């Protein structure tokens, strides 16, 4: 609902629980309420709100959609990278790759995933309908 201050993309709400799991611990005192996640590949911003912006360099976690080179995480619960997904998609086809990597099968995404959401959105963005 809130728009990224850098790229204008609508972000999705994330709780302090999620933000604290992904930002460098030295920045925890700056986490004072909800943030919004910027999912745009080109934008340096990862979390933003009225008070504070955390860019890629302020996170301890690599955010898959923001990374140009491997490792490019997609599923954080099951430790699946873009490379694993496309390697397997070439061998077994995109649908059997999702099934074989285990991407999307976890439940702890609000903490493991920087977006605070299940990795389906990124899987779908990559052409792996789930
Ligand atoms: S991040 Fe993929 S199932 Fe949680
Ligand atoms: Zn942005």
UniProtKB/Swiss-Prot annotation:
Changing residue 118 to S: No effect on iron-sulfur binding. Binds 1 [2Fe-2S] cluster per subunit. [2Fe-2S] cluster binds at residues 75, 77, 109, 119. Keywords: 4Fe-4S, Chaperone, Copper, Cytoplasm, Iron, Iron-sulfur, Metal-binding, Zinc. GO terms for molecular function: 4 iron, 4 sulfur cluster binding; metal ion binding. It comes from the Archaea. GO terms for cellular component: cytoplasm. Changing residue 109 to S: Alters iron-sulfur binding. Its cofactor is [2Fe-2S] cluster. Zn(2+) binds at residues 4, 7, 38, 43. It is found in: Cytoplasm. Homodimer or homooligomer in the presence of copper ions. Monomer in the absence of copper. Interacts with CopA probably in its Cu(+)-bound form. Chaperone that serves for the intracellular sequestration and transport of Cu(+). Delivers Cu(+) directly to the transmembrane transport sites of copper-exporting P-type ATPase A (CopA). Probably has a redox function due to the presence of a 2Fe-2S cluster and could reduce Cu(2+) to Cu(+). This is Copper chaperone CopZ. The gene is copZ.
């Amino acid at each position: 609902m809130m728009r990224c201050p850098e790229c204008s993309t609508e972000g999705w709400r994330v709780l302090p629980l999620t933000v604290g799991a992904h930002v460098k611990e030295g920045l925890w005192s700056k986490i004072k309420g909800d943030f919004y996640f910027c999912s745009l590949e080109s934008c340096e911003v990862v979390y933003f709100n009225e008070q504070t912006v955390f860019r890629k360099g302020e996170l301890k976690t690599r955010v898959g959609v923001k990374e140009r080179e491997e490792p490019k995480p997609v599923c954080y619960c099951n430790r699946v990278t873009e490379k694993m997904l496309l390697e397997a998609a070439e061998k077994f086809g995109k649908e059997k790759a999702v099934e074989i990597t285990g991407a999307g099968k976890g439940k702890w995404c609000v903490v493991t995933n920087p977006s605070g959401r299940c990795c389906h959105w990124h899987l779908e963005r990559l052409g792996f309908p789930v």
